[PDB]
Amino acid sequence: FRKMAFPSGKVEGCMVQVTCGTTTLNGLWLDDVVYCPRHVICTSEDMLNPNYEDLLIRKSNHNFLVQAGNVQLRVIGHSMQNCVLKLKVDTANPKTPKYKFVRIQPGQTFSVLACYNGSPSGVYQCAMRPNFTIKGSFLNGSCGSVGFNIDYDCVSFCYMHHMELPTGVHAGTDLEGNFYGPFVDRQTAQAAGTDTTITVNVLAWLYAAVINGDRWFLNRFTTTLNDFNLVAMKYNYEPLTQDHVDILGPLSAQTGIAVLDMCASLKELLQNGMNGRTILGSALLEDEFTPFDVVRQC
Amino acid sequence: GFRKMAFPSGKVEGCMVQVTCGTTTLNGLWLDDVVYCPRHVICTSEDMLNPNYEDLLIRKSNHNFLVQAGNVQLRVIGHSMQNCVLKLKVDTANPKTPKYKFVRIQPGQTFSVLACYNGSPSGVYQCAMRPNFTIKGSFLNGSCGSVGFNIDYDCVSFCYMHHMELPTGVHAGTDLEGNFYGPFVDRQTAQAAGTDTTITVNVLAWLYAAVINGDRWFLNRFTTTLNDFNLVAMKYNYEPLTQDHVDILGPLSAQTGIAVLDMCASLKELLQNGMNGRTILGSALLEDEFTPFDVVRQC
Ligand SMILES: *[C@@H](O)[C@H](C[C@@H]1C=CNC1=O)NC(=O)[C@H](CC(C)C)NC(=O)OCc1c(F)c(F)c(F)c(F)c1F
Numbered sequence: 001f002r003k004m005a006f007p008s009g010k011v012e013g014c015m016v017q018v019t020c021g022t023t024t025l026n027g028l029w030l031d032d033v034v035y036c037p038r039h040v041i042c043t044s045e046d047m048l049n050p051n052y053e054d055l056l057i058r059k060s061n062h063n064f065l066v067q068a069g070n071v072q073l074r075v076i077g078h079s080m081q082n083c084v085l086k087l088k089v090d091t092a093n094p095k096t097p098k099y100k101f102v103r104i105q106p107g108q109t110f111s112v113l114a115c116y117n118g119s120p121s122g123v124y125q126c127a128m129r130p131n132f133t134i135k136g137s138f139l140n141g142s143c144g145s146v147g148f149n150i151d152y153d154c155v156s157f158c159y160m161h162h163m164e165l166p167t168g169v170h171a172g173t174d175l176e177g178n179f180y181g182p183f184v185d186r187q188t189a190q191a192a193g194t195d196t197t198i199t200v201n202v203l204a205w206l207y208a209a210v211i212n213g214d215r216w217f218l219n220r221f222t223t224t225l226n227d228f229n230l231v232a233m234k235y236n237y238e239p240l241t242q243d244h245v246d247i248l249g250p251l252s253a254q255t256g257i258a259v260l261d262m263c264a265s266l267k268e269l270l271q272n273g274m275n276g277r278t279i280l281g282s283a284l285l286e287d288e289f290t291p292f293d294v295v296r297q298c
Numbered sequence: 299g300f301r302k303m304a305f306p307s308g309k310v311e312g313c314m315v316q317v318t319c320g321t322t323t324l325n326g327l328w329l330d331d332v333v334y335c336p337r338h339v340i341c342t343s344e345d346m347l348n349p350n351y352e353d354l355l356i357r358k359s360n361h362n363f364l365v366q367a368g369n370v371q372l373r374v375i376g377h378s379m380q381n382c383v384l385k386l387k388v389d390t391a392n393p394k395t396p397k398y399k400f401v402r403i404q405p406g407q408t409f410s411v412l413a414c415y416n417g418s419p420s421g422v423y424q425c426a427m428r429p430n431f432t433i434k435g436s437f438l439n440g441s442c443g444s445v446g447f448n449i450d451y452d453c454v455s456f457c458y459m460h461h462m463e464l465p466t467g468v469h470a471g472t473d474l475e476g477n478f479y480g481p482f483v484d485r486q487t488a489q490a491a492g493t494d495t496t497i498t499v500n501v502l503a504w505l506y507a508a509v510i511n512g513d514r515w516f517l518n519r520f521t522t523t524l525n526d527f528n529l530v531a532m533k534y535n536y537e538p539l540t541q542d543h544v545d546i547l548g549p550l551s552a553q554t555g556i557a558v559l560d561m562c563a564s565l566k567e568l569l570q571n572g573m574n575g576r577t578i579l580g581s582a583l584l585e586d587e588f589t590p591f592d593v594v595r596q597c
C-alpha cells in the first residue's frame with residue numbers, strides 16, 4: 001500500500017491567484033466565483049490581530065487582482081463568509097467540474113494540490129488528524145491551496161489552507177470558511193490538542209492485512225463497542241463512532257470478520273504488543289488509510 | 299513538512315484513452331495524432347505464453363483496434379510497432395497534447411505515475427526506478443498503458459509505460475520507445491528480478507530532509523571516508539555513493555551545515571545498529587524514493 005492521490009486535473013483547472021497590494025495567495029475559481037482565504041486583505045503588519053470587517057469595508061472590487069495565469073479576471077463583487085473571501089468575477093470558469101463543498105471528519109483523507117502563485121506544484125494525500133491538523137507540505141504562498149476527493153465525475157472540496165502551527169502541522173477551513181479545530185486566522189501562537197491514533201483507519205489496515213492473507217492477529221473473541229472505546233482511550237487511540245462502525249461495513253462483509261471481533265483483535269495488540277511480529281511488512285500500525293482507501297487499492 | 303509528492307497530473311490526464319482489441323482492453327497515450335499502448339493488447343489467452351508479436355501483428359487490421367476517448371471513437375488509420383509499444387495513427391489530433399518529450403530514466407530517479415483503468419485516470423503517486431529496474435507500484439488488472447512522467451516548466455517528460463507485475467508484487471514496464479527497464483519480457487511467465495539494492499543517495503537526501511524538519515536523533519560526531527562508507531554500504535546491499543552523488547547533495551549539506559560524509563557516518567551507524575525502535579519522519583525503515591532534487595524543491 002502507498003499513499004495515492006486523486007488525479008488533480010479537474011482541480012488544476014480551477015486554480016487562480018489573488019493579490020491585494022503585494023500579498024498574493026491562491027484562489028479557487030468555480031463558475032463565476034473565486035474563493036480564497038480572507039487574510040489576503042491583510043498587510044503583513046496587520047496579521048498580528050486583524051480587524052477583518054474593518055479591513056474589508058475599506059476594500060472595493062477594484063482593489064483585488066485575480067489572475068488565471070497572467071490573464072486578469074475582473075472582480076464585480078465581494079463578500080466575506082467566515083474566514084473565506086468570495087469574489088464574484090465577470091467570467092464563468094469554462095473548466096468548472098461538477099463539484100460540492102463538504103466538511104470532513106477527523107480521520108478522513110483527501111488529496112492536496114499544493115499551489116504557488118496560482119500554479120500547481122504537487123499533489124499528495126493527507127489525513128485530517130483527530131486534533132484537526134493535517135501533516136502537510138506547505139511553503140509561504142501556499143495559502144488557498146485546496147484539499148479534495150473525487151467521486152465519479154464530482155469533486156468534493158473539503159479543505160482550504162490558511163496557516164502553520166508552531167509544531168509544523170497545518171490548519172485551515174472548509175470551503176465555507178469554517179476552521180477545522182479551534183484555530184483562528186491570526187499571526188498568533190496557537191497550539192493543537194494532543195493528537196491521537198485514528199482507530200477506524202487502523203481497523204481498515206487490519207482488514208487490508210486479512211484480505212492479503214496476513215491474519216495471525218485474529219483472535220477467538222469479541223468485545224462491546226463501549227469496552228473497546230474505554231480501553232482504546234488508555235492507549236491514545238480515538239474512540240469509535242457509529243459512523244466508523246458503519247464505514248467498516250464493506251470490509252467486514254468482504255472478510256466475514258465482524259467489526260467488534262476486529263476490535264477485540266486490536267485490543268489484544270494494544271495490550272500485548274506485536275511481540276516482534278509484522279503486519280503487512282511493518283511493525284507499526286498505519287492510521288492514514290481509510291476503509292475507502294483500502295478498497296481503492298484492493 | 300515532508301510528504302511524498304507527485305507532479306500534478308492534469309497534462310497527462312488529457313492524453314489518456316482506452317484501446318481495445320478482441321476481449322483485451324487497456325490504456326493508451328494520445329499525443330498529437332498517435333496513440334501509444336502496450337503491444338500485448340493484441341494477445342489472446344493462448345498467445346500470452348510465447349507471443350510471436352511480429353506474426354500476431356501482421357494478422358491484424360486497423361479496424362481490429364477500438365480506440366475510445368470518452369464517448370468518442372477515434373478511427374485508426376495506421377498502426378506500427380516499436381519494440382514493445384504499439385503506435386496507432388488516428389485521424390484526429392489531440393488538442394490537449396502538452397509540450398512533451400520521451401526520456402529513458404536512470405535507476406534511482408523518481409517519477410509520477412498516473413494509474414488508469416479503461417482509459418480513465420484513477421490515482422497518482424510517486425515511484426522510483428529501482429536499481430534492479432523494477433518499480434514498486436500499485437497497479438491492478440487493466441492498468442497497462444498507464445504512464446510515468448516528470449514535469450519541468452511546462453514540458454512533460456514521459457519515462458515509463460506499464461506492462462506487468464512480477465510474482466513478488468513489484469512491477470515492470472518500458473520507456474516510450476518500448477524498451478523494457480530491466481531483463482523482463484512481455485510474455486505471461488513468472489519472472490524474477492535481480493537482487494534489489496537501496497538507493498543510498500536518496501536515503502541521504504531523506505536524512506537531510508528529516509534534519510531540515512528538526513529531527514536529528516540519528517546524527518553523530520563520527521566521520522568516514524567515501525570509500526570506507528562505500529565498503530559498508532555494499533555489505534548491506536546499498537548502492538555505492540559516487541562523487542557526483544556527493545556533489546548533488548551539496549545544497550542540502552549547505553542548508554543544514556552537515557557535511558555529506560558526516561551524514562554518511564550517521565547512515566553507517568544506522569545500517570550497523572538499526573533504529574532501535576525509533577522512527578525517522580514517521581518511518582520505521584530508511585526511505586530511498588526521494589531524490590536530492592525532490593527534497594530540495596519541497597523545502
Ligand atoms: C499562507 O498565506 C501562509 C502559509 C504558511 C506559511 C508557511 N507555511 C504555511 O503553512 N499562511 C500564513 O502565513 C499565516 C497567515 C495568518 C493566519 C494571517 N500565518 C502563519 O502560518 O504563521 C504561523 C506561525 C505564527 F503565526 C507564529 F506566531 C509563530 F510563532 C509560528 F512559529 C508560526 F508558524
Ligand SMILES: *[C@@H](O)[C@H](C[C@@H]1C=CNC1=O)NC(=O)[C@H](CC(C)C)NC(=O)OCc1c(F)c(F)c(F)c(F)c1F
Nearest residue numbers: 338437438439442461462463464465484485486487488
Ligand atoms: C496489464 O495488461 C497487466 C497489468 C498487471 C496485471 C495485474 N497487476 C499488473 O501490473 N499486465 C499483465 O497482466 C501481463 C501481461 C503479459 C505482459 C502478456 N502479465 C502479468 O503481469 O502477469 C505476470 C505473471 C505471470 F505471467 C505468471 F505466469 C505468473 F505466475 C505470475 F506470478 C505473474 F505475476
